[model samples]
Target chain A: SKYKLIMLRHGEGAWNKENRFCSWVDQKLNSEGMEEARNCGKQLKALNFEFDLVFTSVLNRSIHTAWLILEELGQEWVPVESSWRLNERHYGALIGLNREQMALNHGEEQVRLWRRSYNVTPPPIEESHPYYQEIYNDRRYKVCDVPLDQLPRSESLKDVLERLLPYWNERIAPEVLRGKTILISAHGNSSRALLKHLEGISDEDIINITLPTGVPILLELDENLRAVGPHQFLGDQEAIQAAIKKVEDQGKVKQ
Target chain B: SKYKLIMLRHGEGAWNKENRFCSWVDQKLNSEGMEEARNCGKQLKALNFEFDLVFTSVLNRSIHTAWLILEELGQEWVPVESSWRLNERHYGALIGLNREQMALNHGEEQVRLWRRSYNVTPPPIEESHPYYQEIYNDRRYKVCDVPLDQLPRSESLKDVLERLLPYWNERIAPEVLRGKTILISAHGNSSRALLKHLEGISDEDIINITLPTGVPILLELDENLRAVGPHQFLGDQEAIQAAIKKVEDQGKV
Candidate 1:
């Protein structure tokens, strides 16, 4: 029999609730976000799925969400591996900026283009900037093999795919092939990068994919690791579609 | 400089608070136990101790205690490894029985011998017993390499030392030799088993040694991994002594 792969975007982070671009800044899950993660665990438990391993980004929001989900599943003892490769796409100067204000200041169409375009990178954040300074000396990323010059000041969907695929092919793919049930709790851009590869979506079409926060998507794969059928979200289809639409409409709001 | 090794017994378990025999029954920490574990972390932080790696028993009580300590140190990201070898000495048929009542039922001297004797194994728990049934079928131990007959139905301190030494030599000693600071969260008997080996106490002398629950014991090992000086407890000396005395008096009660 083929194995089950579960992918989850972290619950709404503090910045997510505030409608801000929270690229590499380490934000935590607020109360509602924690509840969302726990609900994901409960839903997975109801479906009788148990994971043998878990993976998450080095960021605290995803780590805490993974912890909460594992606690609910009564599988807290399972091994977890954290890597910076799974981090959300770096938003650079736009990080910590209110998304709606950015849309209004830069014009909604321009903001939309920068956000949704596959190859257009946001403006790079300078080292002297307070936001960049906060993360520049962070101990967590110090151990990551990425060199300072190579580390992103800003990144596009294409860049995220480049960084994320190595970890997928090298670390994660082998485990799935060994028939291990794997769970990944990560962020919006990284989740899309993974889905794009697993589903064989084209680079242009990948720009339109929006994964709702806290929804658990289960993909069934055959012996060849190809998707057996359509990916299923472990929640109501209409509600999940509505949530995805909300995520897509986030930056277009009036300030 | 030699590496620093920190050893901690789990905080007060439900059975520990109730004065019942726990062994491998998998009881969780009570509220006081949680506080004790957090205090262990705070005390370590006060002394500016940081660890590179952590080891704990597969049991939930020890695992939760390790989590609490790491969380207090703001080092929850540290890698943790769990092993059944670090598990508490199996008490077999004595599990779930009240210690004081057992002392009354079987003479106090007999109870003391079973509890404190270095080599006297307690009576074996039969397969038909519910306690044995719970652990025999436990999924966590399913992957452990220990065979069914060799798995303890009862154990003495000698039995515990025998089981624990292999893990120490193979997995833990090499890391300590490499100068990595190590933290171990385990049970009373398992902690004592480790101290006996590190301190080189005689079998008779080891029977008298008692480790206080939740107090962090920091041992400074020389280049050859021998204890350079007396082991230090990371708390008030008087209070730690009093706690150790209390542990010693537990079997007497």
Candidate 2:
């Protein structure tokens, strides 16, 4: 039997519900986000899927989403390992700003380039920025091997892939090779980075990929641990496509 | 300053509330148990206590209790390690049976001996017993280094101590010695076994001690990691005393 890999983007966070950039601010999942997460668990349970191990981002939203899913699956006792490498792409100065407002202020094209371009980093948050200090001093990151000064102030999709791939190769890949069913709960950009690596999508084509929040994307892996086919979302295809479209339009200016 | 150790038995489990002998059955915490866990976190918060690491049993009740407490403390990110050594004493064939009824069927004194005596083992559950199959097949115990044959069908307090001390010496003590504030969420027997070792209580004296569930018992260690004074419960003394009395009476008919 082929190994199964489940990748889940955290449900709508407080900032997500507000149509904000979020990034590394550690915003919590809203009530709707929590419901979305619970529904993901119920759907996975219906499919009779169980994971032997769980991987999650250090951020609370991803961690809590994994917790809810495991609770719903009656597999809360499974071991979970959290790493900062799985964190969302750092949005820097744009982190706490409303996405629609940013599109209106900076022009939709500039916002789109900053958001969707493979290598175009957003404006770096200065050390003086309040949010920067919060992340810098957070105890959770103290264990992160990335040196304090070298940590990302702002990151593009390329940077996200660079940071995320090491964990995938060193930690996750070996586990999957050993035939362990693995679940990864992370954020939008990080999930994209993972999908890009697994599907071997080109850097340019990767920019168009948008993963819907709270959807469990399952990939079947052969004996060689390569994806056997296109990743399947464990829900209605039309609704999932609509959700992904909604996520893609999050950067558009509201009427 | 010396390292601080916090030992908390899980909040009221389903069996705990129903007055049944839970053992290794993996019962969950009831609503009152959840509330108790939340209150424990609140009390610890009031005392301004925080932990760098956590240890818990593999059982869901203990894990869930720890989760509720960590959620309340806003310290859910702390690393948690689970082990069967921290699990409640395996009650063997007695698991899932009502305690009062067991006391009625068997003599109360015999039940008390099984429940509290340091060396008296309870009746062992046979391999054919339904509960026996559950533990034998459970994946959580697959990592337990104890040989399958040596795994407890029933355990005395002494048996629990024997299984638990190795983990205490190898894993927990080193972490505590490094000044990491440690939180242990486990069961009554396992918690008692730990306290017995830490306090250096006499084998006979250990039988008299009862730990109330959901109370955070804080031990201030000296430079040598020896207890500086009596363990402190992070709650109202009167309430704790009453709770302890209630636990002490659990073995009675």
Candidate 3:
């Protein structure tokens, strides 16, 4: 009666090199990100990972990763449904700012508060910003509940969980119960939010569990949508560890 | 009112360089073909053309041309439906071979008869041909009333009419009558077939009306689906004339 859910964060992004906070801003995967996705596909292949259904953010990076993974599996025809619910947590004012810029402008302590705090929000982006206009114009995000004003200035892991869990319960869990192998390819914070909720991680504990880009985390669940087994991050265990360390270091970079 | 039925032959294909008879065989468009489709899209746009629906042959070149054309028009999201009914007349045995090779093997007059005759069918390809066993496995042609065996042989411009007219009456004509702008992106023979049907051209006269790749022919029809005026070909008239001449030269080459 249990279900298996596979979650993958999108590969390294364009802004990832400069250690910028991308949030809701659209950025494509760089070459390293593409290579990471390719390897991730190979890793999924080695693990014999298969899915009956796929979910990706409306953004290109996550969609690209899911497509690459399917191509690696030689199942390019598999159907995919995209939803804005799976998007990365919106980073309001901090959307394009680098870690160093944040530190320089707001000091390390305030920046850390913006990045790691459970409920604190950074400054919200104005509706006139190109980011808001672009997102508003995109048909996918048009129906999203959050308006430009209420859209996060910057979101903590807790803020992500607040938005993500409702959709998981309302839309995704029903599909899982119908016996589909759900694959969620999304952003880092959103995946972490889903992971924290499904794994029953305490709010305080969620901050330490940073997900590496494009890594597939498999969760086996029971009939009640309860976790039936330990979460498995499919890959070389050592490589996953190394990748996680790279993310942690990248997060600390100023620009 | 004259119905405006635009018929476009697909762009140059990958097999075009080898002078292969592409027929219903799926051949991708070369880069030049893509550019031509984009240019055609711009021409259509400049003329303020719009369409309610699009029809393309199931072959990749036709489909790709239609896709690129629509994309160029900024109508990338437009809905498209493809059918083998709109496919180029199937060139059974003569597919994938150059004119010289086919001429030397089958005699030049025989090759000419196969390529240019108004109603003759080409020799049907055998099952062992490279594409037969691999690609024809698609189910679309299987349910067709036209037997696969019969399809292997060549079709004349008249034969294409026999095959295409039914779909015209049952599918395409109704849409045109309903005031939809019908865009038929297809093969040389198939476009000729439609042109023949629309203009009521004789079997002998259809042979002279060669189609150039990527040329868009716009037909204007009256209430009874009769041609009101000459079907207009969009673009530099000289270029279209030259391209047709190139195809005509390929017949000898």
Candidate 4:
């Protein structure tokens, strides 16, 4: 382990609890998610972790998580850099649909196929999607000034990785290599993209990874800033293992 | 003003209540200050004011005020750009000293003379000041990556305007001219620095203008972004007059 960096998927999200596809609908962290994020901050504080800067998605949950962690760490003044590129993989038309609703619209087999695919992008969200125009026109996106066409319509894990790498290289990577402590508050897919890249995980191997909400995963990097070894989550093996199982179980369809 | 801009001194500050010299000390908003900020947000919301971006000082009072206003306005997602340049005039050795303390250390006559100067800077804050090292080495400053020597040790009101113009011209002025709605959450001195420039107030005249806390002042500009007329504070004239007087009274030694 050499240069250290920390990544946290935002605390338990509102949609995460519903097993709903959150994608880019911009739901906030539920009460439990809020506490979970607070606990993550506590953990980092206990370990005496310090962040020189924070990067978060424009989405509220990620932004809120970053704020909570910084407040807990008494580093509220630390600069937070936000961008839409760090948003969760666009679940496309699958957004806001929970399990049964999805079964009613698309067949179970089709849903399963999409979820199982490593490289297949979800169907593009059309203009008619419930929150498309609302989010697309939101001041958060507009103020950041990414043109409408540049925003993603949908994304596969590969697409997510591709979108993330540019920002990682251009903005984040240099700071990491410069020896500045950094924290990333983002989403499941965004986390996977970075984790896979840093560790050079094969596509198939990376799919099996499910990050528990609000847990801090520390990466030790070499001079080239590649991961030195497997990333470490800051908690007990048993609790972390159990938490991982919970995320996997959340996706199961009920009878 | 060819374009429109909003400026607000942060809500009632902790240092503000006791009439202490705030300068560069990172103080917080008192309870009343919090409500004052929330009210400012509410007023903006009721008026259908929409901000594309927000600018604030790194001080907690200003940041907290901005957060309260945005939260009240239901605009938690708006981008907030904070810089040390938006901070209050650096009062140097005068920081944290209240009225009676001023009499105890520096004679009343000397203090008055310093306060009366338009271009005179207060004495530089020394290493011996209690919070000097702690603030200088703070992670916020380090993370923003401003070198130590570049940070101001003392500043006159003119010094503040000089430091602020670059940021204004580079980041903020263009946005204002671009017709993006902007809100500034900052300190009294910082507000004055901008007001002096926009209204083209003379140095000596600008010194006497006291701004009430938390009230939003709107500046109407033309295409050139020059002030078209006197800025308007959003409120009943009598109340605004009373509030302005309160602020002036707060600063009396």
Candidate 5:
């Protein structure tokens, strides 16, 4: 009648430093991002947690973060499954544009709506976009079980939920119901989509919620898979609040 | 109807330099061994080999080697499965003795026979053995899906093949037959057992064959799963021969 799930967002990637909407851009983590993942892993190790299996997005940042965390946990032998279903909400045509540029072109509020709004999808990336070939021709995506054309050219948080739900029901939730200790290593919007689903947050309330990268949150679920209580972050609440502040600022137009 | 199987033995470990019979002691690979695995992985990547799946022994050395190789190949997302069936033949009572000391105690020829003989099993590790608690109490083994009571205390090459064949036939071979590219990163004896099975080496000939640690050997299997021609090592034949000599020397007192 009880289950455990540990959720983590991947640490900052190369584009994060540049204040870009990386999304499905396939950017790897910078050295600082690597340290964040390592430090988060060390914190989990200090708490004495053992994960049975891990789930990660096909993106390098999430997969790399999970590897570092498991390495620190000395549970490297634990199996891992990667799926495009868990990828970040596709940033679409705005991907790779720096914060100031996005803010200048689209206006700050409009950019915010695209990023943080549940149902608002950004403009789909056209084949003419500069990075189109790079994204479409990537070997990893081709290897993804989904048909090439089924790959998303853009997605809102709501769209992400639509896609992630089936995977949750069929692949992840049944195991949680069976009482497996599961770790989900994923992305910003993707993590929120899961949190919104699990904690039953209203759409309006979810728009204001931003989770920090590389922080671990623990959730206890009942037999019916309802959250037993509030989701718990594995570190000092004040520090997590500060990290959340940093995340909240990442999309702003810096003067 | 061709199948691709790439085989690799684990790199050297902490006990390896100490000349200990590591077997199931779960010692991790040393830094040099890590480099070897990385180098080997780079070789595979250069050849444009893409592995769909990797298999490793439940022990840390093999598992670590596979991880490093995948890292070097930039294919970290590839799936890996670990099983005790691919474990090194358990060395039992000889778990951790330095080379000269072992020779002094058991004599050089006896030590050689114990290592290279196909059917010969060293004395089983008793509950009284110093490392028995360590190996038995390890969490990895406890979580290994096999009941802890059934964990091996001793094994010869013959016993290793008997245990490994089921995993090969049921889990590994089926995947290969279905056109999956397979990589097996395993231990000295486990890799030898697979090589023997795949290449149809006789017990007498296999007894003389000591596979180099961290070398990648490619096998092409026909529809019947037998080797089409001679198995190929990834690198130069001359260098592989040198590595083979080094492997042969590992057993000599």
Candidate 6:
């Protein structure tokens, strides 16, 4: 392995538990989510992993989760940089819509396509919708305001790659060159985006890169940013299998 | 019977317990007031009661009661700077009103007078009214941007001298002469005013003056333009009185 890149998805959010879409709407982790995040940190600690620099989304959930993980590593005071580019795919009009209702209204196939399909984006949410306008106005999002205009109105997995890769090249790559271990703690879609690019997974294979809340995926790479092996999940095999299945069935109705 | 000045004042605040107003408003010694000011060091302990510099104001309640006694004699920290001008008289319009209720009703006038009237002031208050304004346009009274002159118009006696003098003359002269054994403390009005005057109390006391609750009034007068008598308060006594009294009188008639 050349360089190590760790992708840790943020713990469960209030929206995740409530089965709601949460793109830019910032929801906090409930108690169970907080515990799950702590457990993720402990699992990483057992592997004796250390990170030189950590990146988090400006959203509080991801930032807080990263903070907790670093604290478990005894690197509580390490410097952190946040960027909006690492945010989850903007759910567009579905930002606050109930996922189950969305599935019911849009039908299972459309819901699954919106949820897991690699190339298609959901409908464009209104600019005046609370999340978009609020993010445009937020000081943190000033740099990404231009990108917001071209953000596909919604994001496909490809769209996530389009925005995320530039950030990885410009910001995250240099840290790896500095011999720093880089941990990117972010949302499901952005982490998946990084996964597809790092592993060179095909567009068809990219949709298979589903992530569970609080799961840590360890990626080993060479100095030239070549992947040495497949991504490894850090948890009990049975638990991870069960959790992945649960995430897969999350919005699906039992027939 | 020369100007034998010995300064002392009451102790920790009764209002300190509750964080209410006891500034220009009257206050009495709580249980803690009966002790000595912490800073009233061994100077008070030396048994040297004779002094050429002694001054106190018109309030016997503070003058004869708090100071002039109960300051542990051994403590050298009890060097006094007595002045009759330093009395605790809350200005007009706010003699007894709680700070909160005043902010709500007579919002600005009460704030302005309490803040601006350095020397002269409004009357005491016990009730709240709606005559206060949002902005005080008096350019002359523009101590700072927020126009302190516009709010509940009143102040403690500390507020008076903050607006008044001893700025150039009254208290500064004798201390500038470099007389070493100076002792001074007075009622709430005089002490706060003098401190404001000496420390350059601005438009706000230039509007208001709130004394520490209970403590000895201590000063070390030195030569040159600098303060020979560094200002110090005796802390062993009833401190936090003003803050306590302010808390007690929050909402009333």
Return the top candidate by TM-score. 5
For A32-150, candidate 6 gives per-residue lDDT tens digits of 88788888888878987766677887676787687578657654424466777898887887788877787777787788788878898888788777677765554344444355355
DockQ numbers for every candidate?
0.39, 0.58, 0.10, 0.39, 0.57, 0.01
Off by over 4 Å in 3: A1-7, A30-55, A63-81, A104-120, A128-130, A137-185, A194-202, A216-231, A253-255, B1-13, B21-100, B103-127, B136-252
lDDT of 4 by residue, B1-253 (tens): 4588999998877776677887778777789999999999998988888988899888878887887898777676677888888988998988877854675576755554455455989989999998688678766676453687778899888899998888888889999978899999988888988988988888888867778888999899888778999889997778888988876554445
Question: How well does model 3 score by local distance difference test?
Answer: 0.73
Model 4, A52-73: lDDT tens per residue?
Answer: 8899988888888887787788
TM-score of chain A of each: 0.94, 0.94, 0.87, 0.92, 0.95, 0.92
TM-score of model number 3: 0.63
- For model 2, state the Cα shift of residue A118 in Å: 1.4
DockQ of 3: 0.10
Tell me what TM-score chain B of candidate 2 gets against the true chain B.
0.94
lDDT of 5 by residue, A1-255 (tens): 778889888887777767777888777888888888898889888978877888998887888899788878877778788888899989898887776677778787887788789999889999998888888886677788788888899998999999898888888998787777888999889988988888888888889988888888888888888788878887888999999888777667676
Better of 1 and 6 by lDDT: 1
lDDT of each: 0.83, 0.84, 0.73, 0.82, 0.84, 0.59
| Candidate 4 chain B: worst-modelled 10 consecutive residues by lDDT | B108-117
Stretches of candidate 4 above 4 Å error? A100-117, A126-128, A142-146, A253-255, B47-52, B71-78, B100-117, B141-150, B178-180
Q: Give per-model CA RMSD.
A: 2.5, 2.3, 6.8, 3.5, 1.8, 23.6
Tens digit of lDDT per residue, candidate 2, span A1-255? 577889989888667768878889877788999999999999888987767888998888888898889888877778888889999999989878888888889888888788877889888998777688778787777767787677889999899999999999999989998888899999888888888877778878887888888898988877766678878888889999999889878888776
Model 4 has a DockQ score of 0.39
Docking class of 3: incorrect
For B1-253, candidate 6 gives per-residue lDDT tens digits of 1112234554555554553445443344555654434334244544444333334432333432323242233111122232324544544454434555565677656554553355455654434522222112322123322344333355544455543354226564555354434555454445545555455556454344444434445554333333344355444334446543442344332
Ranking by TM-score: 5, 2, 1, 4, 3, 6
- Please provide, for model 1 over A1-255, each residue's C-alpha lDDT reduced to its tens digit, 9 standing for 90 to 100: 676799989888777768889888877788989899999999988987777788888787787788788778766667778888999999888888888888778877777767766788998988766688777776566657786657888998889889999998899888999988899999988888788777887777877888898999888887877778767888998999999988777778543
Candidate 4 chain A vs. true chain A: TM-score?
A: 0.92
